[PDB]
Amino acid sequence: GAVNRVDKLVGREILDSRGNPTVEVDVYANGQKRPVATASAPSGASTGSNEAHELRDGDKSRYLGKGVLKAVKNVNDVLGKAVEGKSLENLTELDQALIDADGDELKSNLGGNAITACSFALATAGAAVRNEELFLYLARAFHGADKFENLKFRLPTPMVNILNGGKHAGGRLQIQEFMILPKENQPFREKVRCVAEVYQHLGKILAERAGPSAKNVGDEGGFAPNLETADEALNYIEEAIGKAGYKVGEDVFLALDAASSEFYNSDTKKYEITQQKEFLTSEEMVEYYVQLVNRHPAIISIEDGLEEKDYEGWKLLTERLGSKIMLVGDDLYTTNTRLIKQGIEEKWANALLLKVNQIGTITEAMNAARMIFNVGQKVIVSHRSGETATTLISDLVVGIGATHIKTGATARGERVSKYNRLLQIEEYLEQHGLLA
Ligand SMILES: O=C(O)[C@@H](CO)OP(=O)(O)O
Numbered sequence: 001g002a003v004n005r006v007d008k009l010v011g012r013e014i015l016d017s018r019g020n021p022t023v024e025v026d027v028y029a030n031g032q033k034r035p036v037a038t039a040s041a042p043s044g045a046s047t048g049s050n051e052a053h054e055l056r057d058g059d060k061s062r063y064l065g066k067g068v069l070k071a072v073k074n075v076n077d078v079l080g081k082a083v084e085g086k087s088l089e090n091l092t093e094l095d096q097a098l099i100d101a102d103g104d105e106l107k108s109n110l111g112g113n114a115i116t117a118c119s120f121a122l123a124t125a126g127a128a129v130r131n132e133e134l135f136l137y138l139a140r141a142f143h144g145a146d147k148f149e150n151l152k153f154r155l156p157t158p159m160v161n162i163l164n165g166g167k168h169a170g171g172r173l174q175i176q177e178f179m180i181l182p183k184e185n186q187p188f189r190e191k192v193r194c195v196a197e198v199y200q201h202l203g204k205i206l207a208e209r210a211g212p213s214a215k216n217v218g219d220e221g222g223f224a225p226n227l228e229t230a231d232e233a234l235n236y237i238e239e240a241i242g243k244a245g246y247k248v249g250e251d252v253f254l255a256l257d258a259a260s261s262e263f264y265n266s267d268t269k270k271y272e273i274t275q276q277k278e279f280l281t282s283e284e285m286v287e288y289y290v291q292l293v294n295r296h297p298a299i300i301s302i303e304d305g306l307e308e309k310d311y312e313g314w315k316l317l318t319e320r321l322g323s324k325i326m327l328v329g330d331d332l333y334t335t336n337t338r339l340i341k342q343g344i345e346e347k348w349a350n351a352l353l354l355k356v357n358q359i360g361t362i363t364e365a366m367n368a369a370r371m372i373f374n375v376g377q378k379v380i381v382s383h384r385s386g387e388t389a390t391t392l393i394s395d396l397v398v399g400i401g402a403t404h405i406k407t408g409a410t411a412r413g414e415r416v417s418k419y420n421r422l423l424q425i426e427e428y429l430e431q432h433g434l435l436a
């Protein structure tokens, strides 16, 4: 048609925010000599067996085996050719062409990282050549033209990592992530300011307790002091909330990502909730969370509180706390529609952490979110531990109408750029009268 069609894709090995290679894709379109868009894939700290296969070179002489030249070559030689001449206005067809080209359930022929990077860049290109905001382009793809026409938009509530334990830190605290959430009913610019101020105060509090090194940050910008218990962590966070001038349980709420698979022993069936000290059954773990919420009633969400296949544990956790708090499946689901269907039917949990690159394309990720939306459960659009300059998940969370984003502390460029993109979106929505 020559109007808004793909001329070619060009792949490139770049560095992600952890300094490891990842795939970046340029899209050429409309006969234009310079790319109309560029986006890149994120990367988690680990990739398992129910997720899109992240294709790495394994050449120990480059990037300690983590190069992505093979995946990049698949962009240039296969995936590019599969979308050449196709319209940038139909994201579903573009994503299906990528899926079909690879032809493997786990995307292990061409590489999930190549496919996600192409999906991101092609969606970014489609919005660019239509001279429209990316979240609008994604909203139209998610809802269809008829529901999109008069659609209004909401900004998410951010779940903001500010303190880390587990594998991240040197203490015996095993819960991996402690987050703050600002109250829902206020402008997004005030949500951002609130969590940024709490984050600054926590850093100063920790630097007073332990000196300058205590303000060094982990991969997602959170602090990693040496702590023993979740109560210690939550008490520091509550202190920072107060120093910022906010009220715990009114202005600022708390959330956990236990990453509990990391401290579960499947032979003993015990959770090592305090390193080399305390070992709990599934049932005792649920009771532990119940009492932690009693002591800290501002806790409104717990992610991966039980191990990824401890389905009897999850059923009970959701039985006992599901009416009060979000129970977020991350490892529980790995953005996998087979698991999501089973978890909805069996009532494992009541929310999904959505990682597009775990499933592959944006379209595949939208179907997963739809299943959750369809039963009144919550979608939290998530970063990965290795992020890039692409801010697409900010446009995605608004475009699909999900209530929450989880994209790091208010520090490090690959985290704050997502908050800044949402600040831009909020202004655009206000200016055009699209704010719901
Ligand atoms: O566990 C998670 O929610 C994400 C980041 O917080 O981790 P990773 O990308 O390493 O899977």
Ligand code: NA
Pocket (backbone or CB within 6 Å): 165, 166, 167, 168, 169, 170, 171, 172, 173
């Ligand atoms: Na540790």
Ligand code: NA
Pocket (backbone or CB within 6 Å): 257, 259, 303, 304, 330, 331, 353
């Ligand atoms: Na997680």
